[PDB]
């Protein structure tokens, strides 16, 4: 399908400035299908880009190639994992001889671990694993074209992520034990998203579950496809208006800390995750916990916290769609208050609902919530 396109210094400055100005760390994927006669990588176009970025003092990290397991399908060229590893070594040499010799390198951005993909990854890590800082792979639950509403709400669908993650670690622990593993591109449904589903409240079950599982299973970074774009799996739509997943992501950032713990129901359709609270939130202090939960039951469920947290002051942050479109809404409410940017430069505050000490935690049908346990004074969090 896709033909080659050129891009300019100008384009690079636009992208860089967007990242710099937004407080984001840019990772730039280089074109791996530029090939020599021997089917090695022609480093030359990359060399030109690097020199340009070096000359501008741009702090950028790098990838090489996207879904190389698909090169045959996409471009009628097959690059084995071995060779791709060699190509990465060549990129590493160029980076170390540049003005930014301590720039980071990630790859290979393979698709979800089918057998073919898992053999390409294994051979890549043997060959080129010494020079990458993290292993990147991609995951999508469904095909955008065919996805249904019930798919987005089905725990048997959510659960397949688990074995994908396990399989990636099985490859990495057989080749480069202890190498960090990152989701380099990930969303609900591939091929640009599922319309009226990947862009709605309903997309949030997959997104929050993914975050929870990722953290719990050892993934270090998760990169949502996309922030902005043509695909329906965007966080921000064509009119620069945020969608429910954006608001979910913002709340996650405000509340959820870096130290991952564990929560479990005693009984599949009720999903529960636990971290230390983000201490950078001025409202909360060292030792507080952030619980988050997903209710895929068709009735409200009531959660009771274990000793010694049964009677702590808890702040609820409950997300529910603004009607009438229910789970297919593109609008969301926090504790009954619709979330909307105040103006083009101003995010709203995200207002808690303090609960009665000693009350059970209500989670309505088909909803998700965060709960901050104040004065938890948990040692692991300090």
């Amino acid at each position: 399908k896709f033909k080659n396109s050129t891009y300019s210094r100008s384009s690079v400055d636009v992208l860089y400035t967007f990242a710099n100005c937004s407080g984001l760390d840019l990772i730039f994927g280089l074109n791996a299908l530029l090939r020599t006669a021997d089917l090695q990588w022609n480093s030359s176009n990359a060399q030109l880009l690097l020199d340009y970025c070096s000359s501008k003092g741009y702090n950028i990290s790098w990838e090489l190639g996207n879904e190389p397991n698909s090169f045959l399908k996409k471009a009628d060229i097959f690059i084995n994992g071995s060779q791709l590893g060699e190509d990465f070594i060549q990129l590493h040499k160029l980076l170390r001889k540049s003005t930014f010799k301590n720039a980071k390198l990630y790859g290979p951005d393979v698709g979800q671990p089918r057998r073919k993909t898992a053999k390409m990854l294994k051979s890549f890590l043997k060959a080129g694993g010494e020079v990458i800082d993290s292993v990147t792979w991609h995951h999508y639950y469904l095909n955008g074209r065919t996805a249904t509403r019930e798919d987005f709400l089905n725990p048997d669908v959510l659960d397949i992520f688990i074995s994908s993650v396990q399989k990636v670690f099985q490859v990495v622990e057989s080749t480069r034990p202890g190498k960090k593993v990152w989701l380099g591109e990930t969303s609900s449904a591939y091929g640009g998203g599922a319309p009226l589903l990947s862009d709605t409240f309903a997309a949030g079950f997959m997104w929050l579950d993914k975050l929870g599982l990722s953290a719990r299973m050892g993934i270090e970074v998760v990169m949502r496809q996309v922030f902005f774009g043509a695909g329906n799996y965007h966080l921000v739509d064509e009119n620069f208006d945020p969608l429910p997943d954006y608001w979910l992501s913002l709340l996650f950032k405000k509340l959820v800390g870096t130290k991952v713990l564990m929560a479990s129901v005693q009984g599949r359709k009720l999903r529960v995750y636990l971290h230390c609270t983000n201490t950078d939130n001025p409202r909360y202090k060292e030792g507080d916990l952030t619980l988050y939960a997903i209710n895929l039951h068709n009735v409200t469920k009531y959660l009771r916290l274990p000793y010694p947290f049964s009677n702590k002051q808890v702040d609820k942050y409950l997300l529910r769609p603004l009607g009438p479109h229910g789970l297919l809404s593109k609008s969301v409410q926090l504790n009954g208050l619709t979330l909307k940017m105040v103006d083009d430069q101003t995010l709203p505050p995200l207002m808690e609902k303090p609960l009665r000490p000693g009350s059970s935690l209500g989670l309505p049908a088909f909803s998700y919530s965060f709960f901050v346990i104040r004065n938890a004074k948990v040692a692991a969090c300090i």
Partner: antibody
């Protein structure tokens, strides 16, 4: 019993297209991968592609990729395959198989039960 | 696109004796420690049916006399004894990756 019943034999004309069917019975349709296999008239046998009916995961044979369009139909326990730009190369028997317990690629290892095959004939 | 090459293309074998069909592959058909080979049986005017999966596992309804062995790239179907019904084209197919490939096909005559 576990059983796939494909459409009746089709005598379509050159350059045109046709839709083959493959209804499944005797098991939960959505919990199994359906492959499609092509048999040139007494000339051998070849795989075309599989599809999961819950997820939507299609993978095709490079050879047949621009010719074949596997579609499922959750509602009626049915599966389909469309064939475009028909030549005499496409005059053959097409089987529809099964065999993947699960939803993920690595969960399909072998094809269990098969269809009766649909003879497609292309001459005007 | 592992190349599947089926060593005998036809073989006449005598009723009661053992028939030994080879299947070879490019690359290797083994992920973790499991060899993803599959054997079928196209009766004359009939669809193939699965005989043995993962190289050495007899599917259901399949008699105890059909026996798969091998691993890596070298696989072997073995019928003992040979009965009249067994006459067919036998296919070895790799499941090891996408796309799946299929061997040429070894046909069995009975020496009546």
């Amino acid at each position: 019993q576990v059983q796939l019943q494909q459409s009746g034999a089709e005598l379509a004309k050159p350059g045109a297209s046709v839709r083959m069917s493959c209804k499944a019975s005797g098991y939960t349709f959505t919990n199994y991968w359906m492959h499609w296999v092509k048999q040139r008239p007494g000339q051998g046998l070849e795989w075309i592609g599989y599809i999961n009916p819950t997820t939507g995961y299609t993978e095709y044979n490079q050879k047949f990729k621009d010719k074949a369009t596997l579609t499922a139909d959750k509602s009626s326990s049915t599966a389909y395959m469309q064939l475009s730009s028909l030549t005499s190369e496409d005059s053959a028997v097409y089987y529809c198989a099964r065999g993947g317990a699960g939803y993920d690629y690595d969960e399909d290892y072998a094809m269990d039960y098969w269809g009766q095959g649909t003879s497609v004939t292309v001459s005007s | 696109d592992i190349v599947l090459t089926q060593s005998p293309a036809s073989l006449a074998v005598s009723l009661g004796q053992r028939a030994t069909i080879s299947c070879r592959a490019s690359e290797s058909v083994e992920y973790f420690g499991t060899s993803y080979m599959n054997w079928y049986q196209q009766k004359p005017g009939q669809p193939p049916k699965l005989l043995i999966y993962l190289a050495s596992i007899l599917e259901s309804g399949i008699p105890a006399r059909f026996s798969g062995s091998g691993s890596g790239t070298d696989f072997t179907l073995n019928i003992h004894p040979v009965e009249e019904e067994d006459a067919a084209t036998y296919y070895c197919q790799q499941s090891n990756e996408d796309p799946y490939t299929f061997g040429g096909g070894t046909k069995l005559e009975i020496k009546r």
